[PDB]
Design a protein around this ligand. Structure first.
Ligand SMILES: [Zn+2]
Ligand SMILES: [Zn+2]
Length: 229
């Protein structure tokens, strides 16, 4: 799996998880440190569904160029998993390239309030914790508030791949990240809903860092509870 060792700042690498399923990894520089951020790419026939930008116009343009070079299939739809700039930043680049950008109404409202880029299309049917909707080759799930009140997770049933965005932490992260917008009280319950819905998941992608198995869910609850206390 690519780490910041192999990815310069402003560059994007793809990692093929299964037939028609990739993660995208971008090296982000923020507040003195650098870390890798993950998103997802899922093939849907002869088109691609993108989950999350690469954080910013420049990185997301690099993401599209890397997809064009490595995969050569068009990104026709994108979903942002919550409203923060790292997940919607670059939506304008996607839109200018002809990608239909999507987010829940909650994510769109919060992005607007924050002054962030706003996906054009609305994902209906995700307003209540435990709501799930099918979206092409993935299921979108609103597990409840966690890293943010609007955070979605994404499951690829064909590959048993679960992408958690920033609701799921990598094992090397043993303290809470940015939780300014988090619901610490609900986060463990929201993780339980993820566990209850996708107990068959084989490949779990955290928002940042190395993928793992379903124990990343317990890891995240451990870290969240330790921060709560
Ligand atoms: Zn966030
Ligand atoms: Zn752990």
């Amino acid at each position: 799996y690519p780490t910041v060792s192999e990815i310069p700042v402003g560059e994007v690498r793809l990692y093929q998880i299964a037939d028609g399923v990739w993660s995208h990894i971008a090296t982000q520089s923020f507040d003195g440190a650098v870390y890798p951020s993950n998103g997802l790419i899922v093939r849907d026939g002869d088109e691609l569904l993108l989950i999350d930008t690469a954080w910013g116009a420049k990185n997301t343009a690099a993401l599209l160029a890397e997809i064009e070079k490595q995969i050569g299939l068009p990104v026709t739809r994108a979903v942002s998993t919550h409203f923060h700039d790292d997940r919607v930043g670059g939506v304008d680049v996607l839109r200018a390239a002809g990608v239909a950008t999507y987010a829940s109404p909650s994510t769109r409202r919060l992005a607007e309030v924050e002054g962030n880029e706003i996906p054009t299309h609305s994902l209906e049917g995700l307003s209540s914790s435990g709501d799930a909707v099918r979206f092409g080759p993935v299921e979108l799930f609103y597990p409840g508030a966690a890293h943010s009140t609007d955070n979605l997770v994404v499951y690829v049933p064909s590959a048993s791949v679960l992408y958690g965005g920033c609701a799921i932490y990598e094992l090397s992260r043993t303290s809470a990240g940015n939780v300014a917008d988090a619901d610490l009280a609900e986060w463990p319950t929201s993780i339980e809903r993820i566990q209850q819905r996708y107990p068959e998941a084989q490949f779990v992608i955290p928002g940042h860092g190395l993928p793992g198995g379903l124990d990343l869910l317990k890891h995240t609850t451990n870290v969240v509870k330790a921060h709560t206390n």
